[PDB]
Amino acid sequence: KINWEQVKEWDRKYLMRTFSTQNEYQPVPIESTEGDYLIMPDGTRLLDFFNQLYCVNLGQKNQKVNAAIKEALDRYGFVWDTYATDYKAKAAKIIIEDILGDEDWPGKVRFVSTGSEAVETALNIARLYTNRPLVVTREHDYHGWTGGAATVTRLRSYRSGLVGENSESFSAQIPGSSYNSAVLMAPSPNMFQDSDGNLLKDENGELLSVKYTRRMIENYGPEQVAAVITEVSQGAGSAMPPYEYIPQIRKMTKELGVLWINDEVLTGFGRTGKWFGYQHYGVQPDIITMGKGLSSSSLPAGAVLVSKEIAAFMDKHRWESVSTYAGHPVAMAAVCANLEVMMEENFVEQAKDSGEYIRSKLELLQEKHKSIGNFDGYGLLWIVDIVNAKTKTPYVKLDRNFTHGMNPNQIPTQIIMKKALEKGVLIGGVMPNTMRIGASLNVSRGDIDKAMDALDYALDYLESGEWQ
Amino acid sequence: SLTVQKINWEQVKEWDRKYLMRTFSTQNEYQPVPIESTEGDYLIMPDGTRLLDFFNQLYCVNLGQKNQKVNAAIKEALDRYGFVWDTYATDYKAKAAKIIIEDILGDEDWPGKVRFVSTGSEAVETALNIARLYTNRPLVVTREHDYHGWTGGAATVTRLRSYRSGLVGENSESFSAQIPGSSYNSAVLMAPSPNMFQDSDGNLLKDENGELLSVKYTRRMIENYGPEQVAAVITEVSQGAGSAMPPYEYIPQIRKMTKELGVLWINDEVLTGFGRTGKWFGYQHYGVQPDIITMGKGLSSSSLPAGAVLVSKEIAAFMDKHRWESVSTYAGHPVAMAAVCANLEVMMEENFVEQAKDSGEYIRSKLELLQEKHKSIGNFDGYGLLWIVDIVNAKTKTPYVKLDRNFTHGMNPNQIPTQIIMKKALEKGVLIGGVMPNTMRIGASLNVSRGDIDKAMDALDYALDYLESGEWQ
Amino acid sequence: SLTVQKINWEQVKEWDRKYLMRTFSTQNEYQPVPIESTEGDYLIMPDGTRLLDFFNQLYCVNLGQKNQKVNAAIKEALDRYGFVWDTYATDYKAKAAKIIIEDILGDEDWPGKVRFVSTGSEAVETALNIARLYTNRPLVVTREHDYHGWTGGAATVTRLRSYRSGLVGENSESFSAQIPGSSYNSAVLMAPSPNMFQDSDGNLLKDENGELLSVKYTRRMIENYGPEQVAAVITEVSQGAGSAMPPYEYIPQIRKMTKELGVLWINDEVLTGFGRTGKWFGYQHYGVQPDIITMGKGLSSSSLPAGAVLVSKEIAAFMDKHRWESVSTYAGHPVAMAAVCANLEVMMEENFVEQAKDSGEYIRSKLELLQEKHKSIGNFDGYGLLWIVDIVNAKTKTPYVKLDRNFTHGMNPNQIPTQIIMKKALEKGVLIGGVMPNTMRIGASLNVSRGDIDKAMDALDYALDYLESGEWQ
Amino acid sequence: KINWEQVKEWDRKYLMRTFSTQNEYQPVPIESTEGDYLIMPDGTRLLDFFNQLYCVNLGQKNQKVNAAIKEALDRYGFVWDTYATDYKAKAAKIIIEDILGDEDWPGKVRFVSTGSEAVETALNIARLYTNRPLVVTREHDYHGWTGGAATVTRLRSYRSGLVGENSESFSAQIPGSSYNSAVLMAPSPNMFQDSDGNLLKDENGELLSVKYTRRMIENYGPEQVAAVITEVSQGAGSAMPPYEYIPQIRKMTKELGVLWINDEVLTGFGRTGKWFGYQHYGVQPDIITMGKGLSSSSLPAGAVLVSKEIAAFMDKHRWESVSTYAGHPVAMAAVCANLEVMMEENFVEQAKDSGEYIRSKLELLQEKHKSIGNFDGYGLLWIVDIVNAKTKTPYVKLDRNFTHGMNPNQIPTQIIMKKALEKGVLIGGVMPNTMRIGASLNVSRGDIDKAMDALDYALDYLESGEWQ
């Protein structure tokens, strides 16, 4: 038995708030989860088409994963990274040999506890390998929240600052940590479009976003630029690049002698209907970062994978880095089980096929709803651009440069979410004009149908315009 | 089942060699140390070798290895979860916060609100962010030899040269490579270590008004840079990795100085927290209360990854008035919180703090005896299950390694006293030694037995015989 | 009776080689170029060789070399001074500020107060300090290829790769070194140059709303970083060292964008100031008024070292309410201020600004004729005595040096078209060329004669003949 | 005919204020100068025992210097640093061959226009030569005001910030420029003494301030520290180090492989009764910076002098640095004439002898005035430590960490200055509890007597409490 009234009391009183003021806050108790559902203490079932934070890839509370964790708990315990375990070694082997066995780039893995820690590690390694300070990121990128990872996060609304309650006159950024001269922000891949929706290219066929990135690196000196960090689909920032963007970035970093880090924390492990997001583009990175679907959130884990060449350099030195929980044997047992289930049950193909189905459903919704400007994605990771049906332009002018100071009653994705909730479906987004949709890789056709029906309903309400 | 061999450890060793990034060792020198299972204060190797761990890993398995009540509690949580992120409420997350604030610190008035994260470094990142936002000021003051974590923000306040995630050579001190760009935008002042400013008679120096010179100089730095731009002073009451104990008055004087200057005091309890020092928290030895503490390690006794920051009522009331745009995927992970809950409940119910206090007194008496027969023990200090032992050359009474806490791991371990001691102790099936070259750093579980303490001290005895013989050099 | 000036010029050259630090040249490639005296647009060597200077040194001797009225005025001030620092008042310092505000800019309401310093870089340092203090915000936005000076603060906003006080190799672009540590703490964003987004015809790209793409992305960057932490955008209306002219619409769009975002606009007039462009200031071509300008060069026409910053009435009123703890020894130097006063008085009385406009129109007609005869001229643009000429391969109409304004001085000058032009024109006793590899940057005194313009254009004619006669390749 | 009332009106209206609010500001017009005197429009003569900013070493309006400037103006004009002149080359030769002819360290000079610019250049060269970023400065050092030079200025009251009018209700440091991680602040010399004034030395005889500086460099890594920058007597910061401090810094930097930059902008050119301040200490630096006495403020000039080995390194590269007015030939003619006069008329020995006389005068004042706690100095550069006689402690607690937000009616050096002005003498200090006395190197015994008499009168007043 649980006193949920007491839980709510303690949650209100003793926990720090995020995104909501204490004034406006209402706790949202979840007593248990299963598959694509969250279950409230009263038994209310919610179909979660956020997949929490696009991170419960295998499905909620997988029985084989949970059984694997229980077995680990018969032996461990805790040992730190200086000590070797079967679970930690096997996890690395599964990634390099089993998942990426068809590719030549992978060298060595370091496990840590979170995706932000993975990005911190990737940044440190890239800089040490090149012996150079600068890293290039893009407008709207999200790469985590800790001090180093945040420097490459250029998503205004997710930088751990403070904003006001329904007033945008009160932005307070973290003093001493609100900009960083060791990072250059390049344009979003989506920045250079003409009035007809056509892509701008230079006379050599290079996308203008890539050409501008090249020029920034030339100006600062390629000799001081360690790496370009990307997301193949911006996750929190909610965007899909032109197809040619990632291949051209791979080519340009090669030409300039700069590393390419692709952040796979969100796109990794089947999320996009391939093992990794980069694999849609016929290229290979120098470093990837991992989290979320690495363990499908069963326990906290993150990881960095570096190329053979980078691993060979690191192997020649003593690296003076310690993280207490890095390599935690029970977390690694969860990772092994998660990856074994994904492989054995062909979760990646399930994702590919289900994305193809989602594409079909969104096509039909776009024909019925003029507030849908476009949609794109793959696997279980979709964006839907929301516009005013009458003007065909976004409702929120600041768009991906908005802050959470905004009243949610002015925000289309918040209006959509609140309405879809009436049908027992959690669906919406994190940007104001852009849906961000994701479920478990093994989500059923019936649950996709139920989600799309709730979205159908929310879009009817949005287009009625009676919220205004 | 028909299986008689669940794990092929030869295969594990090859994978570990081939596929895992090294730390502290080059690939060429690396000798893997596989651990198949743990229990209490013991690690068990796949060949059955049992090692008594007087490092308690990283001074972080406070409850003991593989506590059966904690592991059962984790298994129970797995009937229900699953994963929800911090926007959702769970019983385990809310109860964890309540145990800290109401139960453990119910006698204190400063505590306000907790944010849970996954590691001690993430806790420190969070504390720094909050201190800077609350004060609207950028600078944080740390101390020489402090260790506060490894991630970009936490590392800015880490001034322990050998633990800043840089690269050093294999038995050569000539190839230091620090991470390029890592101090761009750092907003940090390094104040003196507490143990700076000693006289030849070993006493810590004070001014005419009795202010320690370490504190007086910290005050001068804050005045010089402008108190109006200094958010916080961050401390460890006992430097963990840095391996130092401050004079008794240092922590009280830092509380006084920060109050007088209008600056916050963050005490980093990631290592000293949860009974490590024979009180619930390290700061409680000093009769003062901080504005913010950071936690990890003993928070879950390493059962699952957890960290936390606890802020004062004043700070929590401020943060409550704003929308805080900060997200961490695993922050508040319900299964991790179930582990914290169980760890803390066992700790409370079985009086682990008093067990630590009592065993510390017993350790003190064993070290007294060791100092009487070993001139290589210059001095020792500590409390609960956290001890430093200053090692010196018995004939000169001066440390062997000149750079001391400013050493790097570029050094050959065959020249390092704490490495010599460790290597010899292992012959007795005991892991004991330290992080710094001239200083032992000793810890075990809070419920460690008297027999296990005796076993470890006998091993140290044997190791010191060998150091003092000078056969190693 | 005749007191001959005792100068051994071979000894001077020896001393210059041995005792003075080199810039732009290695010691081994360096040959000193002694100049004994100057007059009007001419440099005179010790042997009496005369050189017509169509660089006007650094586009900075606006009034002409060794103007008798200015020099008499300096000699007069030396009857009285001496030196006093800025806490003391003099007639010369107060008059210089009055001339700028009430006699030059009396037709505009923005000007408030001046601070005099000794150099253009010092003026930019001061402007950055004031913009940040007034707004209480850290970030300043500059543009790719801007040059704003060389001192630590001014260099942060200089994004001209080849002019940031680093080291490059001798005819090798593989060994170089930027100054370590110089960008720790820098609070600067680099926005696109005004010329960055062009089409095949040469038109600058605009969005459907009519906003230049360069401006659009500048605004996006400010939005992303938070307009609440952006103090200012700093610009040059014509990139001086960077050698570029904006589309007419850029500056009005920047003025509008800054007003809309609540950000200051600093226009750097150190090069374009004081008649250089055929108006008093470069910004005056664009129908707008800035919040702050920086001055140097033509401020005194290099007669003595002076720089200045002029801030708006609203900025001045804010600064006036506080005690500003800033001192510079030579700021307001009374004899340098005497030079400024006389330079400006001569410029006004003899209508040099009007003379410069007229001569620019003349130069325009001369360049038109050169372009019709020389296919190596792709385009040219300018005003007054500041001209850019885009140099291209005559057959392709595209530039020879691909890195263009991102080149370094590591390049061999026998590969740089502007170096080739300079070397050839020298045979005709004319100094003319550029700072960037594909772009001429032409300037003389505001009172340059038609005969000297004709002589310079003749030498260029000769130079371009040789460039497009495939012999240098 | 000059209209000085109109001058005062223009000065108030059109010039930015420093140290004073507009509201409290009273302009102080100076019509001419001569020797150690400033002359007001009404003929009032003021004996200047600040020597402006300790920078008019030769005396005001030296006729030989002014004649030399006039001669240069018959030839120039302006050429920038790429061209050679007799004046620029001769100035460098005078410094290296004539003044420093007895020393082996000097290599090459770069002339610039100000002391701050000299410091900027020195920092750049030290960092390029070593290929290292960090520079160590000391608490209370003043090394100039420009962005780079200001990073090593750790004098709280002189960092180009804003403070209030007789209040603490408004205070503001420059955003983005109020600290710098590429600089480490080491302790001031005399860091801590024991209660009897004994210097704290370790078992190797190393002073505490030096030992701690060494520890900082070890902690940050000597491989990343370019230089230690010092003033042998802190000028604005108003302090004299123990004799052994500078020698031990020279020794320590050599042992650690770190450069020593000694900032001679204020102590240079006879100020201390030697050609350079460092010459009191039997050591040679790697780099010095120069200004002030370099031209005795006749025209703006600064300079950096680097060692033979540093010069040999820079000579191998193309250095992409331009400063328009660096090497200005008329400024260089002034430097030449200034240094020639100093040499020919033995101004350095004049300074030394007058320093000895000043010492005897201050000894007599201390016998008579218990508000004089101590005094020290050399040549024409002195400090006098002022204390409340009845408590034996300084009146202003914050001491060298004060700000100009204080009311000047509470500041001992302000009270002294105001009373001394009744005798037509300008004398006082920069810091609240410390006199900073300087005059021209050729100041007469009669003027020293007049200044000391005015100080005696001022100290009677201070000790009377009547100001309080």
Ligand SMILES: *Cc1c(COP(=O)(O)O)cnc(C)c1O
């Ligand atoms: C969520 C995320 C991170 C950070 O992961 P955490 O586990 O939340 O620290 C980093 N990068 C990307 C692309 C992400 O989506």
Ligand SMILES: *Cc1c(COP(=O)(O)O)cnc(C)c1O
């Ligand atoms: C170990 C430690 C940390 C960092 O904790 P991790 O969980 O290793 O990130 C922070 N502070 C102190 C005092 C520590 O001992």
Ligand SMILES: *Cc1c(COP(=O)(O)O)cnc(C)c1O
């Ligand atoms: C020359 C120049 C400066 C710097 O002036 P200095 O007197 O050389 O310090 C600054 N801004 C611009 C636009 C310049 O052309």
Ligand SMILES: *Cc1c(COP(=O)(O)O)cnc(C)c1O
């Ligand atoms: C005055 C001074 C400077 C700066 O000189 P300016 O000419 O005022 O720029 C630098 N260092 C010291 C020690 C000084 O006294």
